[PDB]
Amino acid sequence: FQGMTEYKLVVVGAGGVGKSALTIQLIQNHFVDEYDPTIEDSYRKQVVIDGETCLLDILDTAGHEEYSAMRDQYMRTGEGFLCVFAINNTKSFEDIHHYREQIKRVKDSEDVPMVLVGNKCDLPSRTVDTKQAQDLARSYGIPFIETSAKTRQGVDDAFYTLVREIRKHKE
Ligand SMILES: Nc1nc2c(ncn2[C@@H]2O[C@H](COP(=O)(O)OP(=O)(O)NP(=O)(O)O)[C@@H](O)[C@H]2O)c(=O)[nH]1
Ligand SMILES: CCCN1CCN(C(=O)c2c[nH]cn2)C[C@H](Cc2ccc(-c3ccccc3)cc2)C1=O
Ligand SMILES: [Mg+2]
């Protein structure tokens, strides 16, 4: 034993779905009301999951980005991916297929650890039903979790679930 296990997590999805708000709620216990578009930012947190101490290295990505060799390079180093849409934005849900294809291409694999995240569950303007998102996740063989970065519903669960998926794949 030379130190805690490290997990490299990448958060992807369309512009404005709440990738940064989810990550800042996890790290700082703070809700960000402002919309400041991301290029690329990285965070670390030590947590205990299923009795194992580990270090989460989290990469928060841009939601609007043309083809970039530099974006492919950091995605290749990711071990697992949170694929985020907003439950009030149907286009962000339709964009999930494109994120999943991008990940499979860069990792050269059909079997990459991933969790589908439906964020902004606190808002009254739902356009994507729970059953539709659950059906999509079942079709991919991955978990689905509903979150709110404002209330904190599901935030720890999304990240911890992704770690559990990475552990299953290693074993
Ligand atoms: N009501 C509510 N608002 C949210 C939630 N998550 C994010 N928001 C709001 O949505 C806006 C965009 O959030 P942000 O985290 O910056 O989105 P992003 O996916 O990181 N955008 P980008 O891809 O440009 O970096 C902000 O005004 C933020 O407060 C949520 O769960 N509920
Ligand atoms: C230290 C400077 C570089 N950073 C920036 C921020 N860090 C800091 O501690 C910090 C504190 N003050 C300012 N920065 C933690 C961060 C650790 C980290 C996160 C993510 C990844 C990753 C995940 C997926 C794919 C590829 C890579 C790999 C590593 C990091 O190493
Ligand atoms: Mg962001």
Author numbering: -2 to 168
How did the manuscript describe this experimental structure?
The RAS family of oncogenic proteins is important as therapy targets because of the frequency of activating mutations in almost all major cancers. All family members function by signal transduction to the nucleus of cells via interaction with effectors (such as RAF, RALGDS, and PI3K) that catalyze phosphorylation of downstream proteins. When KRAS is bound to GDP, the protein is in the inactive state and becomes activated by nucleotide exchange from GDP to GTP. Mutant RAS proteins remain in the active state and hydrolyze GTP at a much slower rate than wild-type (WT) RAS.
We determined the RAS-binding sites of PPIN-1 and PPIN-2 by soaking KRAS169Q61H crystals. Crystals of KRAS soaked with PPIN-1 diffracted to 1.63 Å. Good electron density was observed for the ligand in one chain of the asymmetric unit (chain A, in which the switch regions are stabilized due to additional interactions on the opposite face with residues Arg102 and Lys101 from chain B in a neighboring asymmetric unit) and located adjacent to the C-terminal end of the switch I and switch II regions in pocket I. PPIN-1 primarily contacts KRAS169Q61H with the biphenyl head group via van der Waals interactions. No hydrogen bonds are formed with the protein. Weaker electron density was observed around the linker and tail groups, suggesting that the rest of the compound remains flexible when bound to the protein. It was noteworthy that both PPIN compounds have the same biphenyl anchoring group but different tail functional groups, suggesting that the biphenyl-type groups of PPIN-1 and -2 are key in targeting these compounds to the pocket I-binding site. Our data show that PPIN-1 and PPIN-2 bind to KRAS at the same pocket I as several previously identified compounds, but they do not disrupt RAS function. We have screened a chemical library that yielded two RAS-binding compounds (the PPINs) and have shown, by crystallography, that they bind to pocket I near to the effector binding sites. However, when these were tested in an orthogonal NMR waterLOGSY binding assay, their binding to KRAS166G12V was not impaired by the presence of the anti-RAS intracellular antibody fragment, nor did they interfere with PPI using a cell-based BRET assay.
